């Protein structure tokens, strides 16, 4: 069983947040499941929003905090279900999760046993801005004991999030992708660094793959030791 959510991005205030969760390995009409949305925010923590489920017809139940603003609709043809939240305000910004509640016969409730990956929806009137990606080149100042640190600086984007991978996902050990910082301009920046053997910088290639889904921006940057043209006197 896998639950795959639609991507992150901006919703303008007073408009309708709209997400989808695509199910594989199970049917959205399953007699023994209910299909839920959960939101996770700063201080409200994890909060159940609603669910739909098929017993002999479709039923939906919704949290009182979103009464009259929410719909969760099944799509039997694409084996999906939706979340729509009406008239969103900036305070609706949150990570949203779809999840399966597993039930059986003579049990009318169960835990959330499978979860989507989460979608950060940001409510704001600002426009998206894609990042600039700059190399953090390995140098004498980023080495230590057989090890070299290198990275990418992902600067001036909006909204969160950006995805950073290295070598298309083949490089994961020793990677630190830092939490973004909020710049005074309201834009975000982060860095992603990796520690590699200094012995093999000549034979290995290190490419940071940056994906800012809210703006449909993908950047690949090759990061290499920088050639020297200065100190002009020796």
């Amino acid at each position: 069983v896998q639950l795959q959510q639609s991507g992150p991005g901006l919703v303008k205030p007073s408009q309708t947040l709209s997400l989808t969760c695509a199910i594989s390995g199970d049917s959205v009409s399953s007699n023994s499941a209910a299909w839920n949305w959960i939101r996770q925010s700063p201080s409200r923590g994890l909060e159940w929003l609603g669910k739909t489920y098929y017993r002999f017809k479709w039923y939906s139940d919704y949290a009182v905090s979103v009464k009259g603003r929410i719909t969760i609709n099944p799509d039997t043809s694409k084996n999906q279900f939706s979340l729509q939240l009406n008239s969103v305000t900036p305070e609706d910004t949150a990570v949203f999760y779809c999840t399966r509640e597993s039930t059986t016969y003579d049990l009318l409730a169960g835990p959330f046993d499978y979860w989507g990956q989460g979608t950060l929806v940001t409510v704001s009137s600002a426009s998206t801005k894609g990042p600039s990606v700059f190399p953090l080149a390995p140098s004498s100042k980023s080495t230590s004991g057989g090890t070299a640190a290198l990275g990418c600086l992902v600067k001036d984007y909006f909204p969160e999030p950006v995805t950073v991978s290295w070598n298309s996902g083949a490089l994961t050990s020793g990677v630190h992708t830092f939490p973004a910082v909020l710049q005074s301009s309201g834009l975000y920046s982060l860095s992603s660094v990796v520690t590699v053997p200094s012995s093999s910088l000549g034979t290995q290639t290190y490419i940071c793959n940056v994906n800012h889904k809210p703006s449909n921006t993908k950047v690949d940057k090759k990061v290499e030791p920088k050639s020297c043209h200065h100190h002009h006197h020796h």
Binding site: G45, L46, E47, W48, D61, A63, V64, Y97, T99, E101, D106, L107, A109, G110, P111, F112, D113, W115, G116, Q117, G118, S132, F134, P135, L136, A137, S139, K141, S142, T143, S144, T147, A149, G151, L153, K155, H176, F178, P179, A180, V181, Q183, S189, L190, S191, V193, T195, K226, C228, H229, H230, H231
Partner: protein, 219 residues
């Protein structure tokens, strides 16, 4: 049904036991079938919660047996019999006894390990960025413990303020360390007015503050 948890957090050494408490404001033991409608989840940063325990005491398939749950219909515990590095996370309990289903506020679990000094690195701005008119200098503190650290920027030995931002990682799931990135940002004009760019790092693992520096336009 308000769910509360205790403690709010904990940090203990590898191989120690940890118990996390959870309470529901009314009973979630169902008289009809004598089941407790109580689940526990593990959540790591960037990931969805992951079901550990349900029916208060049944371990979910694929969950290590060092996780167990027990409870009384209103008071519940999650126990990790022997804490492992990959257990750093937030642990939530949740009742599914009555709508609306409600979650506890979470208990954050961190590993207490031995002191480890940061490896300090510095990166001048890229030529590509400098063409854009801006210079970002990055100071990197790699794989240190404990999380407390102080970075100071000095430009030609003058202490900086108001032009840097930093952030720290979550705790590493393998070596239980933290890493920190600090970025000094100047205009290209301002950057090119000075020579020595340095970050100075104080940490419990360092007998005296470590300074990492470069000379602009020198190599």
């Amino acid at each position: 049904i308000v769910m509360t948890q205790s403690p709010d957090s904990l940090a203990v050494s590898l191989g120690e036991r940890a118990t996390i408490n959870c309470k529901s404001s009314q009973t979630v033991l169902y008289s009809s079938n004598n089941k407790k409608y109580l689940a526990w989840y593990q959540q790591k940063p960037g990931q969805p919660p992951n079901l550990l325990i349900y029916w208060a005491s049944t371990r979910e398939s694929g969950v290590p047996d060092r996780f167990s749950g027990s409870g009384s219909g209103t008071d519940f515990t999650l126990t990790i019999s022997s804490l492992q590095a990959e257990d750093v996370a937030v642990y939530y309990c949740q009742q599914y006894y009555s709508t609306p289903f409600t979650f506890g506020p979470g208990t954050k679990v961190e590993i207490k390990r031995t002191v480890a000094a940061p490896s300090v690195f510095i990166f001048p701005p890229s030529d590509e960025q400098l063409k854009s008119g801006t210079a970002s200098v990055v100071c990197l503190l790699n794989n240190f413990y404990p999380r407390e650290a102080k970075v100071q920027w000095k430009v030609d030995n003058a202490l900086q303020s108001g032009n840097s931002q930093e952030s720290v990682t979550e705790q590493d799931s393998k070596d239980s360390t933290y890493s920190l990135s600090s970025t000094l940002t100047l205009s290209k004009a301002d950057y090119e007015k000075h020579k020595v760019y340095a970050c100075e790092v104080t940490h419990q693992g360092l007998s005296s503050p470590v300074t990492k520096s470069f000379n602009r336009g020198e190599c």
